[PDB]
Amino acid sequence: MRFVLDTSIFVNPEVRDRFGASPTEAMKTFLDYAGRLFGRVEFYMPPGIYREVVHFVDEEELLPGIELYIIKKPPNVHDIRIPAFVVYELIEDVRRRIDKGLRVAEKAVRESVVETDNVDKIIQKLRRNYRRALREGIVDSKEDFELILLAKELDATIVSADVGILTWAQKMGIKWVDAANFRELLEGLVKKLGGKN
Amino acid sequence: MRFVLDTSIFVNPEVRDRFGASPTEAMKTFLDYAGRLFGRVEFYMPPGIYREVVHFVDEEELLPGIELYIIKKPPNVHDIRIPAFVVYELIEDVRRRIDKGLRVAEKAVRESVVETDNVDKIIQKLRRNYRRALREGIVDSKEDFELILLAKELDATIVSADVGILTWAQKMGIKWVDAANFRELLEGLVKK
């Protein structure tokens, strides 16, 4: 049994809280389950996803588990074929993520700026935040593709709280589970396989 | 012989001028060649590309040719498989198209915003121009994929002046020609 993990159960405050009060504690709780399933169940992340979660998590404090129990593996691309509609999936993902980023970038400017600020100061704040929304929207959509393609090739279950990802997985015939229910699934996997829970 | 046409030879002033002084004139000149090659050479556009060209071209003033000699055909997507690296090509294309838009949005904001605008007005000018850059960057990248996939399925030659599209065609082993030389290519086909 193989799982491909999105950032959700570690970095999304409304789902990672089922595992811990911080990303580091959430990861620690996850790794305790992953350790108890070592050799029976494998957990994968594309490298770009892993780099995002460990921006928030204390990697040094979670050795050896953080390196042994999460497999960092980019999907294979050479000689691999995918449905053509995947391109439309990626396009909607980019538009979905960028539109949200623009709102976030706008709301961020409207909290920092005061009516007395000059024109150039206002423009540089919006341009900076808009540029960040675009670049993050693009990388994250590519990372979404990596997750999908990795789980497809591994015949693994995707673990995410992102509705767009789960619908995309569904359409491609990829197994998935809602990340909000992942701890429940992990608890049931330990009980099905033995050992202290 | 089959050709898949980008907007270039109709809407890009630096390329269509080789066919006519306006998009309508360019289309008229092109249809002149396309009519005389009817039955020998077929010309295709994805529907989204066609709608873009005829926003600038008076479709009414060019009947019957504009309807007979250009085949509007979306690529097939159902049950179609593509190489996975196409998605990476599309990602680079999106970034390329968005980057171009940012320059357009940049100059447009720079001219539109004035010292007197309140905070709401500056934000609305910036948001409006950036959203338009994003929207067009997204549509153009999807149309670029439609062009690419169409030419793939037809084994047709892409006709474009867009560096992104030609590089994408090259990587995928799709025939292409620089649209700046298309009239010259058409002239040589007609003499045949």
mmCIF file of C-alpha atoms in Angstrom, chain A residues 23 35 42 107 136 138 141 178 182:
data_model
loop_
_atom_site.group_PDB
_atom_site.id
_atom_site.type_symbol
_atom_site.label_atom_id
_atom_site.label_comp_id
_atom_site.label_asym_id
_atom_site.label_seq_id
_atom_site.Cartn_x
_atom_site.Cartn_y
_atom_site.Cartn_z
ATOM 1 C CA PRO A 23 3.872 21.660 11.283
ATOM 2 C CA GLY A 35 7.406 4.240 11.581
ATOM 3 C CA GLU A 42 5.155 3.469 1.881
ATOM 4 C CA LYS A 107 -5.761 42.195 0.738
ATOM 5 C CA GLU A 136 3.649 30.572 -6.625
ATOM 6 C CA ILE A 138 2.756 28.396 -11.434
ATOM 7 C CA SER A 141 0.273 23.882 -10.291
ATOM 8 C CA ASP A 178 -9.507 13.415 2.096
ATOM 9 C CA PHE A 182 -6.048 10.603 7.075
#
